Design a protein around this ligand. Sequence first.
Ligand SMILES: [Ca+2]
Ligand SMILES: [Cl-]
Ligand SMILES: [Mn+2]
Ligand SMILES: [Mn+2]
Ligand SMILES: [Mn+2]
Ligand SMILES: [Mn+2]
Length: 456
Amino acid sequence: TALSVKDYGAVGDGIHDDRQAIQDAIDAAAQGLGGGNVYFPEGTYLVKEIVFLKSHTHLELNEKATILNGINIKNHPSIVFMTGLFTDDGAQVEWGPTEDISYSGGTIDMNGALNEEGTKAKNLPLINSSGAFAIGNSNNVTIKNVTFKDSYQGHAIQIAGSKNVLVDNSRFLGQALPKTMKDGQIISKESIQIEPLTRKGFPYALNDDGKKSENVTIQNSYFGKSDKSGELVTAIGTHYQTLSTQNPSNIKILNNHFDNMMYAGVRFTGFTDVLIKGNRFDKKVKGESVHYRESGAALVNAYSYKNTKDLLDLNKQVVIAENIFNIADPKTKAIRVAKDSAEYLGKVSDITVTKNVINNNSKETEQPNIELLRVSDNLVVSENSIFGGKEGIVIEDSKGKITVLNNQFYNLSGKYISFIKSNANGKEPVISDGNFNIVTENGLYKIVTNNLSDKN
Ligand SMILES: [Ca+2]
Ligand SMILES: [Cl-]
Ligand SMILES: [Mn+2]
Ligand SMILES: [Mn+2]
Ligand SMILES: [Mn+2]
Ligand SMILES: [Mn+2]
């Protein structure tokens, strides 16, 4: 009983514009037809404008069904699916709540591969970025088993002010980066952005009260490159927050494979209650990468938004556990959690880094494997295994309760653990060499012996 998009005129040849047919299918499903189920037979469905998902609709695409992004409009977004209306810039409308939407199967060709000059998207010369989904003010949205290809310096998915969103068993292949782009713009392009709902981060609607995203889970998915464009810059995260935005919360990133990202597998500021668990982060050498960042990378990077005037709600309750890191690039850091500047007024707290396995065989590593900078309270770094590199764990300028218990180190060339504090002008240890533990007793710190050493 699922309605076929062919029932409404979709040709599926990649030449005819099938947008209207697809929209009519969705609209009918939203009314109740076919139980809200829409089906996509094998084929290539070109769309020259945005398709709008509606409440209680469920799209299923054949394995050989491909949605081709043909949205090439000046001063206009090039995102295939949205959960709210959009016409032209300057005519945005408020997006009302939507819910119970599912999308499964097939491929979405965001069509962002570069022209031979590498200055623009070859098939969409007028766009500034391309993506697949713009999910805003939505509830209970499920995206699964979808292959996303060639984003033109954009977000494959944006989840803003949305609750109960699941991205599962999908593949994010390739992100095109043109010659002309600056680093500032580049690192702000996460393939899956999870953010509060503001016009700044979600210019597709008028909603501007900073509604948070909540209960978002990205799991069992693969992130890498395609045969047309290089590795993604940042797989998941966000890069913006203000006193007026509510922090996305209960964000779970589980069992994903981040295959050689250029900057980070996970990077964010302004999240609360995050769980990054059982993921695999691989990083190859510059020579085997299409995209490479000279400035370096940090596979997991929970940082603080640059702001010295406001007391922001910086990252809190972040758990980084049981992840595996295979690093070959000497400029790549495995894990980083920080309040980047002593000038930031907010606080980073309740940080847990446990049972992670770091395999660093890069030559002459240029930085620590695990960096914890200015955590204000409740920091736990325990039972992590680090194979290779220079420094193992660096804890700098952290306050409050700190617990570092039974981590393992093998074949390291530098200090296993560095517990550092600074004064208004310089640096000195809080209290050191080899493997040991740190505990907080009555507000005070103390090194404790543990007999776990490398005998390789
Ligand atoms: Ca969580
Ligand atoms: Cl939970
Ligand atoms: Mn339009
Ligand atoms: Mn956004
Ligand atoms: Mn944005
Ligand atoms: Mn490229």
